[PDB]
Amino acid sequence: AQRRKEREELAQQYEAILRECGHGRFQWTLYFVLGLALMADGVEVFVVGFVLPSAEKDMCLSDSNKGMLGLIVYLGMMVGAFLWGGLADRLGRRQCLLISLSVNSVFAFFSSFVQGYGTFLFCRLLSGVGIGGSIPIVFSYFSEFLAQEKRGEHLSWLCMFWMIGGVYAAAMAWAIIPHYGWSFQFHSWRVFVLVCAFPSVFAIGALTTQPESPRFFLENGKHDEAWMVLKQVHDTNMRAKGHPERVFSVTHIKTIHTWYQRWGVRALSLGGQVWGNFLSCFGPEYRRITLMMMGVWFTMSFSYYGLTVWFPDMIRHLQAVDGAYMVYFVSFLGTLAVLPGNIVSALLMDKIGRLRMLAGSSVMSCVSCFFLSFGNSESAMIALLCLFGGVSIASWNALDVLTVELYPSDKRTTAFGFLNALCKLAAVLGISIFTSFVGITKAAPILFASAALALGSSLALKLPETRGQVLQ
Numbered sequence: 001a002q003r004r005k006e007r008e009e010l011a012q013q014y015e016a017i018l019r020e021c022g023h024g025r026f027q028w029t030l031y032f033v034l035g036l037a038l039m040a041d042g043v044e045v046f047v048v049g050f051v052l053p054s055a056e057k058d059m060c061l062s063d064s065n066k067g068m069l070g071l072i073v074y075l076g077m078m079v080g081a082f083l084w085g086g087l088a089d090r091l092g093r094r095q096c097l098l099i100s101l102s103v104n105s106v107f108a109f110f111s112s113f114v115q116g117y118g119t120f121l122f123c124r125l126l127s128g129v130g131i132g133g134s135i136p137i138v139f140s141y142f143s144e145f146l147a148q149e150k151r152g153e154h155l156s157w158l159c160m161f162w163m164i165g166g167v168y169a170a171a172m173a174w175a176i177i178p179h180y181g182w183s184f185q186f187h188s189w190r191v192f193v194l195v196c197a198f199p200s201v202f203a204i205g206a207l208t209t210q211p212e213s214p215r216f217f218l219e220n221g222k223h224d225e226a227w228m229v230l231k232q233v234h235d236t237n238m239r240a241k242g243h244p245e246r247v248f249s250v251t252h253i254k255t256i257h258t259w260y261q262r263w264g265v266r267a268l269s270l271g272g273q274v275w276g277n278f279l280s281c282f283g284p285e286y287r288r289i290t291l292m293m294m295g296v297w298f299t300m301s302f303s304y305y306g307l308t309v310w311f312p313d314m315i316r317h318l319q320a321v322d323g324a325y326m327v328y329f330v331s332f333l334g335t336l337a338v339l340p341g342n343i344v345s346a347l348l349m350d351k352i353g354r355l356r357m358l359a360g361s362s363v364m365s366c367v368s369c370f371f372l373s374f375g376n377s378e379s380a381m382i383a384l385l386c387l388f389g390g391v392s393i394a395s396w397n398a399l400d401v402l403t404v405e406l407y408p409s410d411k412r413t414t415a416f417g418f419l420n421a422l423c424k425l426a427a428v429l430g431i432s433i434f435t436s437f438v439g440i441t442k443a444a445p446i447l448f449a450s451a452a453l454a455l456g457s458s459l460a461l462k463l464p465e466t467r468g469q470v471l472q
């Protein structure tokens, strides 16, 4: 009972300090810096989903190897999400984000020069492992600098960079891969892979300049470092707004108080702490919340990734009844249609609340998925896919905000990483099942996705409201 009281007091004082610091130049600079990593994650997702399964350039593997090539990377993303989310609660958000981005960059760079299918598979798997940790770390890292007044809108604006990365990867694919003349053992897919690694390098370079989260310092006994970071934030914000004469008034902050053999014992202790943090998410205080979160994350991920592999095959069926450029253009349109949903969700998140956003978006996504069964031509299918994505992204934004706000700071990245790993597993399962339903029928995939979305909405209706409360 003592620890909960002390952490509530710390949360109240931290909210007061953030109100004193204000929102301004520092927050937007960090926003762009973390948006770079989100863009890197979007680029990785596009590459894995479209060009990675040897569309035309590689063609050095069997069809079974083509299917495995993507799913193993999704499994690596799941593993990396869990690992880096767990480690971020013990080592820090900035440290683990830097390590994961470095691993992703190194192995993405390595995969460009390898001359073998096995080595390419290994490098892409480890790149996925490195990149899987971005979202859970980034969202918590940015949330730990935001006051409660407009926290939801600021968190929702962060989702634009995933779409930006998808667009960047689509344009680079469109420009590079068809130009086979750029080959010099070397081909154009290697140039594309090399170019796709630039956003991660830029993210690392920018992130080197930003400080560690002061909330992590306060939760771990490092009062002075947190005070220095908060004073830096306050000074930057006040100098930007034209009041450099103002003095940071905070004095004291509530604080929650061979070599390889030592490496081994340290690793064992760290793994034990991570496992304890994971198991504490199923305790009596959080078990019901965690179970409801698992259902909403799983059903939404299962439906989206199931439809997005079913959709291109259905277009191919329509084209039979009626080029890589069409693939690039369709992927670009599908990722571009997300923008209005992101804008509207960012503008309405704090006005109407996370719960109403999630419920309405889930209902609209289910309705649009059911409407997908009425497709009769390529153009109508493209429009319906754009509509579905635009109406569905808002549920993902609201779920990000809820996951950020539903867990305490000492387990936030662990819970987020577990949920993101569950999402990657759901993506794997949905891709496998909807590929197993390639031509057997048409009603069944649509019905399955609609039922999953309805179950997700039903579970989302039962979540608690976190709006208007200090960040626990």
Ligand SMILES: Cc1cnccc1CN1C[C@@H](c2cc(F)c(F)c(F)c2)CC1=O
Binding pocket: 045, 135, 159, 162, 304, 334, 335, 338, 388, 389, 390, 391, 392, 393, 394, 396, 400, 423
């Ligand atoms: C931002 C984010 C937050 N949490 C977990 C994962 C992510 C990244 N996303 C976005 C999701 C998405 C939803 C849509 F409806 C679309 F139309 C679309 F193109 C993409 C799927 C994914 O991988």
